[PDB]
Amino acid sequence: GKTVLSCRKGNGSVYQVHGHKRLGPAKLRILDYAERHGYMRGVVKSIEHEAGRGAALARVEFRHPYKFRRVKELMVAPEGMFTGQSVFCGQKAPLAIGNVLPLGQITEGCIVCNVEAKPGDRGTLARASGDYCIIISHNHETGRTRLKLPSGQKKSVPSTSRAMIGIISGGGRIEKPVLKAGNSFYRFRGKRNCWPKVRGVARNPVEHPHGGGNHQHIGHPSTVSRHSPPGQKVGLIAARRTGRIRGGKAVKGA
Amino acid sequence: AKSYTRPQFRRPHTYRKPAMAKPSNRVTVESKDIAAFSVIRYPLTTDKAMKKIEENNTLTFIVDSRANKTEIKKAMRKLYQVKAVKVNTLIRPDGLKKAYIRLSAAHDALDTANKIGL
Amino acid sequence: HFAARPKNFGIGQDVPYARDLSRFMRWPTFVTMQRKKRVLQRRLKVPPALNQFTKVLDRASRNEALKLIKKYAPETRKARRERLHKAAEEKKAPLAVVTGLQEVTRAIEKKQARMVVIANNVDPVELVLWMPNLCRANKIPYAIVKDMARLGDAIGRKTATCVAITDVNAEDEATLKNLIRSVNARFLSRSDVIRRQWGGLQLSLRSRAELRKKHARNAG
Amino acid sequence: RLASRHEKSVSRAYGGVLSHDQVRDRVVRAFLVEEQRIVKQALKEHSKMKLSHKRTANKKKS
RNA sequence: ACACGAGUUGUUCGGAAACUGAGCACAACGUUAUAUCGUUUUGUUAGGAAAGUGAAGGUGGUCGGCCAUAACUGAAAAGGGGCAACAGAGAACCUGGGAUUAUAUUCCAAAAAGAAAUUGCAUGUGGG
RNA sequence: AUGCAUCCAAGUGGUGUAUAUCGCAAACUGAUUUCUGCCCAGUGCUCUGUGUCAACGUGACGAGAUUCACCGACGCGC
RNA sequence: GCUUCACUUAUCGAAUGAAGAGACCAAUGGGUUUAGCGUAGUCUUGGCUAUGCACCGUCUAGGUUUCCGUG
RNA sequence: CCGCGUUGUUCGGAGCGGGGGCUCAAGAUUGAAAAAUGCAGCUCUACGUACUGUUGUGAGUUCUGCGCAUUAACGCAAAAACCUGGGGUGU
RNA sequence: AAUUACCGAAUCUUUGAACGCAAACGGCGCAUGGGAGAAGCUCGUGUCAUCCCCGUGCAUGCCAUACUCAGUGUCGA
Numbered sequence A: 001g002k003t004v005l006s007c008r009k010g011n012g013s014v015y016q017v018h019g020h021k022r023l024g025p026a027k028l029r030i031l032d033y034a035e036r037h038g039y040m041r042g043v044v045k046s047i048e049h050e051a052g053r054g055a056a057l058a059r060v061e062f063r064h065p066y067k068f069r070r071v072k073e074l075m076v077a078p079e080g081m082f083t084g085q086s087v088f089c090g091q092k093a094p095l096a097i098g099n100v101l102p103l104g105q106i107t108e109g110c111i112v113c114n115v116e117a118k119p120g121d122r123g124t125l126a127r128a129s130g131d132y133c134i135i136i137s138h139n140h141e142t143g144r145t146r147l148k149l150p151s152g153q154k155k156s157v158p159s160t161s162r163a164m165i166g167i168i169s170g171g172g173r174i175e176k177p178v179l180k181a182g183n184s185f186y187r188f189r190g191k192r193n194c195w196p197k198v199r200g201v202a203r204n205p206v207e208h209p210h211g212g213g214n215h216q217h218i219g220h221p222s223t224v225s226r227h228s229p230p231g232q233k234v235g236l237i238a239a240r241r242t243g244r245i246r247g248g249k250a251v252k253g254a
Numbered sequence B: 001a002k003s004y005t006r007p008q009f010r011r012p013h014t015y016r017k018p019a020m021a022k023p024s025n026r027v028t029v030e031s032k033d034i035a036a037f038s039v040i041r042y043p044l045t046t047d048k049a050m051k052k053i054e055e056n057n058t059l060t061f062i063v064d065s066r067a068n069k070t071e072i073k074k075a076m077r078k079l080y081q082v083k084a085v086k087v088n089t090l091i092r093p094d095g096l097k098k099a100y101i102r103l104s105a106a107h108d109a110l111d112t113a114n115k116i117g118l
Numbered sequence C: 001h002f003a004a005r006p007k008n009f010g011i012g013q014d015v016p017y018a019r020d021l022s023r024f025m026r027w028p029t030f031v032t033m034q035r036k037k038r039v040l041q042r043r044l045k046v047p048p049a050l051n052q053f054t055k056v057l058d059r060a061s062r063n064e065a066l067k068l069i070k071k072y073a074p075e076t077r078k079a080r081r082e083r084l085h086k087a088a089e090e091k092k093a094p095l096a097v098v099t100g101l102q103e104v105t106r107a108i109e110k111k112q113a114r115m116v117v118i119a120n121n122v123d124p125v126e127l128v129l130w131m132p133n134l135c136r137a138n139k140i141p142y143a144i145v146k147d148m149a150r151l152g153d154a155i156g157r158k159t160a161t162c163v164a165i166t167d168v169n170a171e172d173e174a175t176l177k178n179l180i181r182s183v184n185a186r187f188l189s190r191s192d193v194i195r196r197q198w199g200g201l202q203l204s205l206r207s208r209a210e211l212r213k214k215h216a217r218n219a220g
Numbered sequence D: 001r002l003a004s005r006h007e008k009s010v011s012r013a014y015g016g017v018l019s020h021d022q023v024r025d026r027v028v029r030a031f032l033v034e035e036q037r038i039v040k041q042a043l044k045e046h047s048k049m050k051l052s053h054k055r056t057a058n059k060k061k062s
Numbered sequence E: 001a002c003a004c005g006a007g008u009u010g011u012u013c014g015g016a017a018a019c020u021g022a023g024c025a026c027a028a029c030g031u032u033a034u035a036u037c038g039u040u041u042u043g044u045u046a047g048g049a050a051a052g053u054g055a056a057g058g059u060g061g062u063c064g065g066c067c068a069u070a071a072c073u074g075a076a077a078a079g080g081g082g083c084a085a086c087a088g089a090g091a092a093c094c095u096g097g098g099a100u101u102a103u104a105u106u107c108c109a110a111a112a113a114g115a116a117a118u119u120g121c122a123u124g125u126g127g128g
Numbered sequence F: 001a002u003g004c005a006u007c008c009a010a011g012u013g014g015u016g017u018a019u020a021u022c023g024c025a026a027a028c029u030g031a032u033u034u035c036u037g038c039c040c041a042g043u044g045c046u047c048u049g050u051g052u053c054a055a056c057g058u059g060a061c062g063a064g065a066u067u068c069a070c071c072g073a074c075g076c077g078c
Numbered sequence G: 001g002c003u004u005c006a007c008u009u010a011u012c013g014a015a016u017g018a019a020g021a022g023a024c025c026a027a028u029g030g031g032u033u034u035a036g037c038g039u040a041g042u043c044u045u046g047g048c049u050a051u052g053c054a055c056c057g058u059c060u061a062g063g064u065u066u067c068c069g070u071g
Numbered sequence H: 001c002c003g004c005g006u007u008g009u010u011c012g013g014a015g016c017g018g019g020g021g022c023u024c025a026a027g028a029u030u031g032a033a034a035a036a037u038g039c040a041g042c043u044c045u046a047c048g049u050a051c052u053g054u055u056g057u058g059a060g061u062u063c064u065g066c067g068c069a070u071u072a073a074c075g076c077a078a079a080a081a082c083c084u085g086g087g088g089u090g091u
Numbered sequence I: 001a002a003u004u005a006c007c008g009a010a011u012c013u014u015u016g017a018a019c020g021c022a023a024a025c026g027g028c029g030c031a032u033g034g035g036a037g038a039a040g041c042u043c044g045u046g047u048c049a050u051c052c053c054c055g056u057g058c059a060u061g062c063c064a065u066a067c068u069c070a071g072u073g074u075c076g077a
């Protein structure tokens, strides 16, 4: 009879991101003329931590292409990125770790990160800590590059969309156990209000579809349709299969 | 025009005429000579006021509450032919502004306060 | 010591001169959409009733026409305030072209005009969209000239949609009839072509060059 | 703001901005990185002119 | 308590003038039968011509080819205003007093009991 | 990401998202240790696509309205 | 009716302080205000057209490289 | 190229330790202020006068040393205002 | 020159649609005009630097209007 908590987070009031101590958005520098034809060189000045990421950032210093100034550029770093490194950025840039060059120019079987799903949107794929994409092939009739995303789900992207070379920095993070509810307090401190997580069976029937009863049970089957309304779509949303996955590992996604 | 060197079109500066000064909007006389009788209202005659005339040098007046210390000094020159060196104003809990007005030690405080009469 | 210091304007080199960013700048909304309005009238396939205004009488017949419309322009306000104050003394219009969209229409329904001159760019185009087919149904020679600023300049206005010529003086009568033969070649005797010539469907210069290099590579 | 410039700077280049160990590390690389390109620029023009008489000397050999 | 008469003094103290923060929402734009609605800091408004400031020079009264003061031309500055902190930022004054019935880093007058710090503007002396 | 969940009367609207599968969203169980068996008929979900299912579209009788015939997707059937 | 291949101008999305897009390397390209010269067939209000084709003109230059190259 | 040093988890040919220095930060000291002030006494013929006096290797103190500075899957606001340089002018 | 009633002439603080910008601020502007002015300068008068008072113009949208513009909109030399 009352609104479900998952529906309430879309109002986004108490549940927005905790962004006051965050730095800017981490993206690649602007796809200008200087990268469509040549390379821009920068230099890494600082390796940075912001709250709510597990990957290290980097401010790289370019010269502005058209004015007498220098552009501070906050990128997310790969592993091995040291201060002073001279990142190169563009078409004629070489094939080294830290450089950003189009996917047409990166030979096959190469680990890339900060790959972008359309040219110019400044990096949208493989940016969580320790992730990377692998370049499978190129097609020169269509001008598209087909690469393996960190989930295994393949994706064909245009070969003019650029990518950085390396693993994303800060990898190995999930492999240590948290051990405390105190350490999960501060993990979600710089993220957003989503912790502690109360189970639906622990609720009353007014708050959640699973709530109520004299035993904490889900009554109905907990696999809901894709077409369920907001409020009814809780549980295992459109589950193709449930249970302990006994066997291989299917890639998850459409 | 020509020679567009910036990525966006900002507004060209045309010739812009000044505005005419209007003749009048107020039809009322305002005498500059009576204009300091509204600044200074009347003196206080209390015990703390009488002590400061004799011992320090100061005079005490209720003034209007929307005057500053500079225009109280200039009204204590045109009304009373004395020189104020220091005014210490005070908006009272009564609602009135009270000023302590110290004279310039070339002017006696009692000789002014007899001419006013208090 | 007047030596030369050349600046290197390669990529990543010395910061360059100020270019002309006129073709890549954010323009105002009225100039970026009066320029896309002109593309869109060119790219789309235009019916033969609006195609006919893109087909215009040439310069030698237009500069002959408006110079003849100039000398039979209507008299001005002073030239009409006089001849009436000099005729209220007689109890005490010499000759002109027909101008105006209500007056030129009557000169064709009555078949009094000997030549009609139509502008090509009136801003609601439906005002003179019907106008060549009225001259064609009544067999008055017409023209569509490159005008509406140049017609109003000829007659003393800012804008004229149409000018009709009912009659002239006999001095420039061969000039009037040489102009009618010059203008029926383009419009009235060529009427069966004008009725069925669908215009438009032009490409970009940029799209056209992607048919050269898309066919020169599949040339074998 | 009320102090002299000398309590806030020092008498050399980048004084009050950079220290002595890195004013000199910029003097040294403003010389060595400029002169390294001069070695590689003059090597480049010496290569293209040796090409200009490796094949133009084959006009008198066939 | 009641009646009557008094009592809060600042260049520096707190605030504002004059900061930004979480945020707010004026203009602009869109929506709505309806503005009393939405967007409006991830560098930042608005399909979006919101800079009224002015480098250098030309023109002609001033100071020893430099200044400075008055009026035309035009390099260069993308990203409109205003709020929100009396605990964050910022902030030039400290004692002594026999100076109160009650106020004081606030009042004290020629030996200011006195000792300063600071802002604006101006003469004179001296230096370029 | 031409996404998932979701706000929302409405828009070139809003949140997770200053993000980008070591991420975000929805559930269950409840530290370690030791294990987690059998059941896909029922009921849910979900996947590969010719019975049946509406409007539209098509054709015909008739003076026409009205009829009749055909085509008709998700979805259940399989 | 239906459709799979190429289009781009509506529409959508992203990026950008709308900062260098395409050509010049050339047509299954344009042009009576850029239609100059012809050539076949065909029509006409004698002013000239339409179809079909050839040429001309718009149409210029260039880092590097021994014609390629593609700013 | 075992050495220096801390109560303490460390440092050094990418320059330890000695010898001479240059600086910065926190104090100490001499002075101007400032004795004229302050306090407590007291002495004399009226809120009157004249004189007299002005250590500590103890304990507690967050001012400071102090940060690329804490546990951290916690990494610790911003801006105005100001300061110095680069480059230019003065040439 | 009573006082009362009536009304033509006026006065009408701070606000408020509230409109120069703000606001738990009797706060702060940009043009423009007037004032006062114990410092200076002047040959005590004048003049008067900051400071300080007072009037007026200035919200935004729109209509009409009389000058300066933008536009690879269409022309035109």
Ligand SMILES: NC[C@@H]1O[C@H](O[C@H]2[C@@H](O)[C@H](O[C@@H]3[C@@H](O)[C@H](N)C[C@H](N)[C@H]3O[C@H]3O[C@H](CO)[C@@H](O)[C@H](O)[C@H]3N)O[C@@H]2CO)[C@H](N)[C@@H](O)[C@@H]1O
Pocket: A124, F001, F003, F015, F017, G013
């Ligand atoms: N829904 C279908 C279409 O999706 C379009 O938008 C799509 C994308 O453009 C868009 O993705 C963009 C992302 O590409 C780009 N990096 C920036 C943008 N923040 C993203 O939007 C994202 O952010 C917000 C969360 O705050 C989400 O509401 C939104 O669903 C999410 N996609 O999310 C949508 C994916 O469905 C248009 N909004 C519109 O044509 C239409 O809604």
Ligand SMILES: [Mg+2]
Pocket: none
């Ligand atoms: Mg009482």
Ligand SMILES: [Mg+2]
Pocket: none
């Ligand atoms: Mg400590």
Ligand SMILES: [Mg+2]
Pocket: none
């Ligand atoms: Mg107001």
